[PDB]
Amino acid sequence: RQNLKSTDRAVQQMLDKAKREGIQTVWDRYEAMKPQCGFGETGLCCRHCLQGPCRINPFGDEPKVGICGATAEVIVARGLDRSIAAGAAGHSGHAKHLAHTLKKAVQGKAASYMIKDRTKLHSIAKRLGIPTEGQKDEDIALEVAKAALADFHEKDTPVLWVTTVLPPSRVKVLSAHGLIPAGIDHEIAEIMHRTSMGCDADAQNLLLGGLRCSLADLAGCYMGTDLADILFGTPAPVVTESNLGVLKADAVNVAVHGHNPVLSDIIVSVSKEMENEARAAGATGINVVGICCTGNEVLMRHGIPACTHSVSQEMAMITGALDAMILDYQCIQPSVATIAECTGTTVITTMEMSKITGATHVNFAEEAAVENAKQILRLAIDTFKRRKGKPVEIPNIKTKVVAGFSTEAIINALSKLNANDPLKPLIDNVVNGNIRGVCLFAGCNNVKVPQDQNFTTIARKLLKQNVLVVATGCGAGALMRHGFMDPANVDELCGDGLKAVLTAIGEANGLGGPLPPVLHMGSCVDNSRAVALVAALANRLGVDLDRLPVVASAAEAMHEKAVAIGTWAVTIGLPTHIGVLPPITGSLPVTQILTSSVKDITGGYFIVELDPETAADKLLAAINERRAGLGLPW
Amino acid sequence: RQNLKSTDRAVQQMLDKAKREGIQTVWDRYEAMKPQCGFGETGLCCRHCLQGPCRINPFGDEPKVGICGATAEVIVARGLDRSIAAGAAGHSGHAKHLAHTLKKAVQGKAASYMIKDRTKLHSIAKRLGIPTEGQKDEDIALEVAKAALADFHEKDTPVLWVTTVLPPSRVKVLSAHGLIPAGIDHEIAEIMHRTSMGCDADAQNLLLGGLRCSLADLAGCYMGTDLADILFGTPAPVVTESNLGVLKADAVNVAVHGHNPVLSDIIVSVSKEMENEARAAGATGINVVGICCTGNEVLMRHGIPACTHSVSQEMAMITGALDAMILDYQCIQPSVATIAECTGTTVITTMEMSKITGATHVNFAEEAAVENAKQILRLAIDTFKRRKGKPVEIPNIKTKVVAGFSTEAIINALSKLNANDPLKPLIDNVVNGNIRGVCLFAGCNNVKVPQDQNFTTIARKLLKQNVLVVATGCGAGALMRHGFMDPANVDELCGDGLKAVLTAIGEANGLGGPLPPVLHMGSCVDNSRAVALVAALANRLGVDLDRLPVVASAAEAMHEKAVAIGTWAVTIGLPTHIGVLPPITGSLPVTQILTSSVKDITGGYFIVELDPETAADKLLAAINERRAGLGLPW
Numbered sequence A, B: 001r002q003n004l005k006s007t008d009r010a011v012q013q014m015l016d017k018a019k020r021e022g023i024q025t026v027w028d029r030y031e032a033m034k035p036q037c038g039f040g041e042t043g044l045c046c047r048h049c050l051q052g053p054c055r056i057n058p059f060g061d062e063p064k065v066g067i068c069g070a071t072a073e074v075i076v077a078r079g080l081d082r083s084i085a086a087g088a089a090g091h092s093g094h095a096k097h098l099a100h101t102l103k104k105a106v107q108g109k110a111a112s113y114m115i116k117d118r119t120k121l122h123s124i125a126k127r128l129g130i131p132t133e134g135q136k137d138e139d140i141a142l143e144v145a146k147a148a149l150a151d152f153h154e155k156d157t158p159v160l161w162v163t164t165v166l167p168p169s170r171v172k173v174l175s176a177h178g179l180i181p182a183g184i185d186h187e188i189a190e191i192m193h194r195t196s197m198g199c200d201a202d203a204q205n206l207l208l209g210g211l212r213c214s215l216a217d218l219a220g221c222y223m224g225t226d227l228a229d230i231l232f233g234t235p236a237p238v239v240t241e242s243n244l245g246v247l248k249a250d251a252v253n254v255a256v257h258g259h260n261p262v263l264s265d266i267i268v269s270v271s272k273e274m275e276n277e278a279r280a281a282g283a284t285g286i287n288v289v290g291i292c293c294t295g296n297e298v299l300m301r302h303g304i305p306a307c308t309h310s311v312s313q314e315m316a317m318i319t320g321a322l323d324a325m326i327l328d329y330q331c332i333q334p335s336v337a338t339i340a341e342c343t344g345t346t347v348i349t350t351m352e353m354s355k356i357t358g359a360t361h362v363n364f365a366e367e368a369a370v371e372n373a374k375q376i377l378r379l380a381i382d383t384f385k386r387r388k389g390k391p392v393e394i395p396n397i398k399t400k401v402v403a404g405f406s407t408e409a410i411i412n413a414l415s416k417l418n419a420n421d422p423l424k425p426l427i428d429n430v431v432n433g434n435i436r437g438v439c440l441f442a443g444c445n446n447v448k449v450p451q452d453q454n455f456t457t458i459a460r461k462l463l464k465q466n467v468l469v470v471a472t473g474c475g476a477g478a479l480m481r482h483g484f485m486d487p488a489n490v491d492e493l494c495g496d497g498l499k500a501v502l503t504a505i506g507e508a509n510g511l512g513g514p515l516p517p518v519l520h521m522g523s524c525v526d527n528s529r530a531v532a533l534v535a536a537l538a539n540r541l542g543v544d545l546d547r548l549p550v551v552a553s554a555a556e557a558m559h560e561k562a563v564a565i566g567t568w569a570v571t572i573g574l575p576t577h578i579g580v581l582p583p584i585t586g587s588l589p590v591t592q593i594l595t596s597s598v599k600d601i602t603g604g605y606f607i608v609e610l611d612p613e614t615a616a617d618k619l620l621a622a623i624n625e626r627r628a629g630l631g632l633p634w
Ligand code: SF4
Pocket: A046, A047, A048, A049, A050, A051, A052, A053, A054, A066, A067, A068, A069, A070, A196, A197, A198
């Protein structure tokens, strides 16, 4: 019964092939882990010193307290804080790498990289207060890169990738609670300090630190988007495909997998120059396909088709047609290195701090990006040759995907209805009820949840209630693989008011049809694009984000990064659903802070709800409560 | 049978009082935790994403691998790396606070602080390459503080508090393996990134990252010592007392507890100015006593007596005479806040990122240090008044302690035997066998080990074999409370060769007697002083640290900080004993790297040995192997 594992029928087909071939999958490794530890599930375990491990019984008798005296409240809050810091360390490490890449590019140390989006560069400079008039673009870019790197440590200003991206009234609320980060890596380190043994031991104090570190994560996300747009271009609407059927038996199939596209954007361009070298090997060409966020990056900017996402990533290899999987970091199941020996795929790591035993490593350096890409693609061509004559099983399943909805692209699309006040048509339709509110789907799949089931169940209910739905990361991946990015499905999926708006915008953009049911705003760092859009709406209305009918749903969350994103969504003022249990239920006081009393600090709050129908109802209630607070019908 | 809990007879007495009064202690909370989780004990548990908790059976059947495919090797190495980063975050956060304090002092923003050790300031400037000739001391200090803060982030130089404190040949070895940190908080964040889900998954690669982060911890330790010496004075030999008998029923007893003495050095000076205000309340005066590292700081600089350490910290409160416990951060059992309600003690937190529910918080700001100290001490005086007429039970147990052996003080003491080559007398006596080698005892007590039993058992065996023993932190605390810092015990404890050397040095310093059996080199950050001494010996000999007959023992380790210290001791080239099991035994490959194949990278290695007699034999074998490598008899 593969339907209990994944709602994706291409994934189901490959699960059947993996089973008859004896290849263990993530779902098999989950089954072998059951029953999982209830102390860990509830957050009532601590290993922060060598007197541990400590645990607390959720209910009953002793143990009731950690060996040092740490209560359930403290243990739960410390664990959560460390998860937030780990997420911030990933998103911001990605951003730091892009900042170094931009600096190298404009210093003449990496000519494969350049300022591709001069407009974005100048707008970021203006937002940061960096002078542009009279200055060479390379010098403006050097100053932007230096400002990015400066936000990682303490200085005479707070983190500008927080304070310059949210409205002043929001910054004021956060400043009053001490929540503005002083420096990105500074906050990460302070979390690790305060959560170490014999330090912070007050749940509220710990959680305030967590909120501040989540804003350091937001800064890293926004910095990542900004720098990637400068270097690689701001996305605009594009049409492509998704799911395993985008693989081609006749081609060299190369997946780019990870989050930082610094090399894989180069993989894309170099691959086109090697079509003839691939043809000499008997292929039709090189077919680059995306997995996870780096796949989203190249989908958004170049229309590279998305193969699969998150929990089902191993299934691309099970087809037998994946000649190479080119990795950088984050969200890569290390099982890919052993599965590759069964499937023939060449798995290649490229970043010094992210290696996998058994996978080939090819150092990637920006300074040698083209040469390193050719080395990598030649391993892929050799692999294609080795499968001459072997049957492959690529499920003939794919969907049409319209994507590329950066915030700039959304504003441009709206400007076709109102050129000099582009946000007003959107606001007008919120006011008149054609758009009930906005929901951002974000985050991962999680093996505990039948793959995509929460995203699609919740999205269907919200769309029928006229909610404008936007999506990023593997939430966008789930929705795209089930047809939610195909405008042909607007009639089936969308309420009449939402359909009218999507159609009015689409027709004004010359499409002869609507925008798609869900707007793909990009990778997980590109959750920052949704922040930009919401902050622009807030500023246009003269209100703060916690008055807007905007919610978020990390419906199948997995990674520490998703915990960090959900926490900053709460911190900036949003009702934020999470569809898997974070390790908090072992402390009622912590749960009550995160789901209730944080409303009094930031106006946002977590909605923890594992039943997707119920979660949809709770998200709609949150949207409608915001409508009522604005005096609007609902 | 309290002897199974602590070998300290004052602690035993208070354990009897706690038992009859029904006050739960750390030992009771340990007993209530048994049996502890074997997955956590062995390191075979991962909670790095919301698909967990994952575990691996040490032996038997499934589960054999994490849900994402993470092997035992990966899980163990990731957990260890996070512990190292957490330790680095503590030591370096302490250092960062001191750097900000020095900057404020010389900018005229905090006149309670000043350059007290101008000689240290100029020597640090010279070591860092900061110009002094022609410059005002305040400007040199501003440049030192700015250099300290710069080492937290990437810049055009590596972390100078690594590269300028180790000999060039050691820096070259470490650079060749990629182990020199780029920035302190940079490395902490990169650890949290690389150990997050779907990132680094190669044990060797992970552990190399851990070694590099441990050097970021060393940098924070050395920076902490350097800045504390500038601000508060470099220690020189001092005589005081230790153990609970240093409390006085007739006085206001105030413990300073934590690690950062930035306020407690101020507590010491302000307390003397309030003797009359205390006398008006019916006390004889204010009796400041030390717990843990901040107690070590004021013991080393001012001869403040040490009350207790680490695992037994609650027992100071059980006497009934502890009127206040003034806290900043790290190693404070949060149980003190609840015990205080039973004992009458006022527990006071002072740092924004380290609060304890139920404890009074008094913001400490350097800018208002004196006024904030008086507010704190007045709460203590009020508490003393409330116990007018209540009997107290202070065990009449204390030892004499000679301490204050900074590296400068050790060199000065040796210079009385050889004025212009002060290290030569020490080397001469290593060569002739009067000193077999050097052992640094470091780190915490741990409730799993009868308190002090490993430190004293190992130290006794090494001293009888003519090993020069130095100590820091709660290792120094254990040894001082058992008489190892009293020169009257040299005859009983020391081999004939070591006694001859300690006597020759002492007589040349005019003491009419020897140096004490063990040299107290200070707090845990002051493990950096031992590095300075060993590096000076290495440079004097023209060899690297991994050829010297010098070892370390974290004989009863507890905190993540102790894991970080042990790891940098290995990274700089030392055989390093740990007397409690770190969570590594679930992976034989990781254990073999840490205890064997790391020798081929850094020349150091861990010695994991829970039996103290066996550990002493293994440490002596390590020392003697180094002697043999130098061509010396042993
Ligand atoms: S920090 Fe406290 S609760 Fe955590 S493992 Fe150590 S003794 Fe146990």
